[PDB]
Amino acid sequence: LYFQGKIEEGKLVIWINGDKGYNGLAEVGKKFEKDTGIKVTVEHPDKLEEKFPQVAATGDGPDIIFWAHDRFGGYAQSGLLAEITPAAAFQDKLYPFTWDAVRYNGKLIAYPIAVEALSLIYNKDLLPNPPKTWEEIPALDKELKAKGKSALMFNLQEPYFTWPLIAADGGYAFKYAAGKYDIKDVGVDNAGAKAGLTFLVDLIKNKHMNADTDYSIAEAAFNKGETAMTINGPWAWSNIDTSAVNYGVTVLPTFKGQPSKPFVGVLSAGINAASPNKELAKEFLENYLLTDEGLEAVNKDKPLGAVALKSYEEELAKDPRIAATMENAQKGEIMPNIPQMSAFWYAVRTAVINAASGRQTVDEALKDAQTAARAAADNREIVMKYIHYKLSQRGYEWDEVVHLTLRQAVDDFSRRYLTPFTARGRFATVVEELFRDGVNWGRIVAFFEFGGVMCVESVNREMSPLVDNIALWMTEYLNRHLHTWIQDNGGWDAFVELYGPS
């Protein structure tokens, strides 16, 4: 068990993405180092959000990781983040919905920092008074086309950008009720979602937008003054700052009289569950970063958008672009921190592209996405129930006909036929070789057998967080590379008919 050794125990080590204000955060760290005598190191490793589950599974990695709250759900599932219970006096300093964003299974698992959502960005010279409604955009585009301009260009390829319109009249991902998501209630193909996507498609059919417009095309057009409006977040502001475009930021247009509902991301600071510096990290976050002066140093370097600290948000909101960011966030929804969200996004991305290109009607595209989002949730449950069963056979405790049919098939298959880093490499190699010459039920059963054996070896070598990493890897592979075959071959019902008793 050599993995129990540590690295750089004497320093407070922070990971934050390279597109944030890490030099400003480093300025906060330098003051903390001077005041405490403990070295603070701010690092911005490429792909740190994927490295953290690997390094933290053996008790290593940074003491503090900064990322959008929704990713912390998968971290907290694996037990990688320290549970915090900050004082009520400190909690009252931040907006209540930001604490909601960092709550997983009823436990606070990070400190909220910043708040960001999409806003309507408009060229003040071209459009001094931007439209309040989606419905008035076609007429506005007609006027601007006569001047060689267009009304609106935003990224149509990623559903993060198109969801605020789809949600406006009633679309939703998973039904959310008092901090809990009903995984069985998906609102992708209801009447409200169809109405929003139909309006988007009509904009393209009537030549007000182009189905091929992506992030690069929309940003280049707006920042060159060719289109009056775009839809984007605070990460895009610095490129417009240095351009000749004089831009404002305002509330998203309404649709059928209802607000556009963007998903809200809360940049948050999680503490490594195995950190030897947990209390130092708590002090850095509570007493140095989450102050007016701490957030200002970060915000100066790179804009945070809105912030979770009420006192500094009130100062920042004197600029209407920040007031607009918070207003759009308040009219939207916290990005769900549940693992079932990844397959939701893949399904909705396909639906928008198919409907916008004309390969499917709005009705068929969203019916496919609804079924895919639900079926991927079912797939996750199959993975979790099997792993729990395989681990229960060995005496390890870990937190209907399909489940019984599959676990007998794996037991039959077994009689006939380690670190987080080496588990990831072995998984990729075995899974690729397993399905190298196609997919069939026998290869899927072998897939579950291989995964369950790896999970047992994980708990044997005293690295139980690796079990959750493996279960996530199996779920992602099932939903991203086996879902199409399963559906086209009769689904899990066909598996039961082949393997179960008749």
Span 119-261 CATH architecture: 3-Layer(aba) Sandwich (3.40)
Superfamily of the domain at 2-116+264-316: Periplasmic binding protein-like II (3.40.190.10)
- What backbone phi and psi angles, to 5 degrees, belong to 43? -120, 150
Expressed in angstroms, the distance from the first to the final Cα of the chain is 48
Backbone dihedral region for residue 271 (phi beyond 0: left; psi -120 to 50: alpha; all else: beta): beta
To which H or E segment does residue 45 belong?
A: none
Q: Which of 44, 88, 82 is closest to 66 using CA atoms?
A: 44
| Same fold? 2-116+264-316, 119-261 | yes
Cα Rg of the chain (Å, integer) = 24
- What token pair was written down for 61? 């990695």
Backbone dihedral region for residue 30 (phi beyond 0: left; psi -120 to 50: alpha; all else: beta): alpha
Count CB neighbours of 276 within 10 A. Answer: 13
Q: For residue 193, which amino acid is it? A: A
Q: How far is CA 197 from CA 18, 130, 140, 188, in A?
A: 34, 22, 20, 10
Domain boundaries, the chain: 2-116+264-316, 119-261, 376-499
**Structure solved via:** X-ray
Answer yes or no: are the C-beta atoms of 222 and 153 closer than 8 Å: yes
Q: CA-based angle 297:302:307, to the nearest 5?
A: 70
Instruction: Lay out the sheet containing 150-152: strands in order across.
Output: 150-152, 227-232, 119-123, 247-250
Q: Which of 44, 35, 36 is closest to 14 using CA atoms?
A: 44
Cβ contacts of residue 427 below 8 Å, gap of 6+? Answer: 451, 454, 470, 473
Write down the H helix ranges in 394-440: 401-416, 420-434
Q: Which of 120, 116, 115, 349 is closest to 254 using CA atoms?
A: 120
The gap from C-alpha 348 to its chain's centroid, in whole angstroms, comes to: 14
Answer yes or no: are the C-beta atoms of 123 and 225 closer than 8 Å: yes
Domain 376-499 class?
Answer: mainly alpha
Question: Rounded to whole angstroms, how far apart are CA atoms 264 and 95?
Answer: 14
Q: For residue 41, which amino acid is it? A: T
Q: For residue 75, which amino acid is it? A: Y
Count CB neighbours of 283 within 10 A. Answer: 16
- What token pair was written down for 502? 């008749």
In a 3-state reduction of DSSP, which class is residue 386? helix
Count CB neighbours of 354 within 10 A. Answer: 18
- Rounded to the nearest 10 degrees, the angle between the axes of helix 191-205 and helix 362-393 is 130
Q: CA-based angle 44:48:50, to the nearest 5?
A: 170
Residue 393 buriedness (CB in 10 A; 0-12 / 13-18 / 19+): exposed
Question: Rounded to whole angstroms, how far apart are CA atoms 131 and 253?
Answer: 7
Q: CA-based angle 372:373:377, to the nearest 5?
A: 110
Give the resolution to one decimal, in Å. 1.8
Q: How far is CA 141 from CA 147, 220, 352, in A?
A: 10, 18, 22
Question: Rounded to whole angstroms, how far apart are CA atoms 140 and 131?
Answer: 8
In a 3-state reduction of DSSP, which class is residue 101? helix
In a 3-state reduction of DSSP, which class is residue 212? coil
Q: For residue 200, which amino acid is it? A: L
- What backbone phi and psi angles, to 5 degrees, belong to 185? -110, 100
Residue 337 buriedness (CB in 10 A; 0-12 / 13-18 / 19+): buried
Question: Rounded to whole angstroms, how far apart are CA atoms 324 and 335?
Answer: 18
Q: Are strands 103-104 and 150-152 parallel, antiparallel or unpaired?
A: unpaired
Buried/exposed 37-71: b ≥16 CB within 10 Å, e otherwise: ebebebebeeebbeebbbbbbbbbbbbbbbbbbbb
